[PDB]
Amino acid sequence: MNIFEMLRIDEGLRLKIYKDTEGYYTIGIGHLLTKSPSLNAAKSELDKAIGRNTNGVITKDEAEKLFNQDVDAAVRGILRNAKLKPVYDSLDAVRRAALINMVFQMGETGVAGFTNSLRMLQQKRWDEAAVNLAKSRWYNQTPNRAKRAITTFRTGTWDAYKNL
Numbered sequence: 001m002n003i004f005e006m007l008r009i010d011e012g013l014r015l016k017i018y019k020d021t022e023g024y025y026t027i028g029i030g031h032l033l034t035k036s037p038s039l040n041a042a043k044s045e046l047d048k049a050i051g052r053n054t055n056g057v058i059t060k061d062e063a064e065k066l067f068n069q070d071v072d073a074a075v076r077g078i079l080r081n082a083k084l085k086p087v088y089d090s091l092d093a094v095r096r097a098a099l100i101n102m103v104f105q106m107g108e109t110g111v112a113g114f115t116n117s118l119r120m121l122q123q124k125r126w127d128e129a130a131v132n133l134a135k136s137r138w139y140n141q142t143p144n145r146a147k148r149a150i151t152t153f154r155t156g157t158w159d160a161y162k163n164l
């Protein structure tokens with residue numbers, strides 16, 4: 001198991017524009033297009049991202065390419081973030097993947113706001129951090145996915161993703 005496989009399980013793969021859990025236009029493997037309520041705005045962002053007139057539909061290769069870019073961007077945002085970087089450096093390989101997952105889903109800013117959980121993770125207080133992470137809108141709105149990430153942080157293994 002690795003970050004790519006992990007996120008592919010959490011986000012799924014859709015080749016036509018769709019609305020995510022928050023109702024935002026998205027495509028591929030969780031690639032957010034726009035928070036705007038307009039399909040046109042979404043189609044236009046898609047074309048700009050792919051480099052062609054797509055008509056709201058892309059191929060698998062195109063989806064994977066956006067995915068690669070997005071993971072890279074997520075890692076780069078963590079490393080550039082003063083609050084995130086120290087946490088990430090302190091963690092093992094499996095838990096790093098869970099932090100990337102969260103950044104991919106909610107953005108650097110969002111994650112950087114979990115101050116208390118971040119400090120617990122850096123301290124290696126696994127159970128405590130897991131309880132604190134669950135007290136969030138994130139867990140209440142997408143509980144199954146949040147549970148998977150939280151279990152990951154708690155155990156340092158891929159058990160939550162094994163079977164999926």
Ligand SMILES: [Cl-]
Binds near residue numbers: 049
């Ligand atoms: Cl892009």
Ligand SMILES: [Cl-]
Binds near residue numbers: 141
């Ligand atoms: Cl969920």
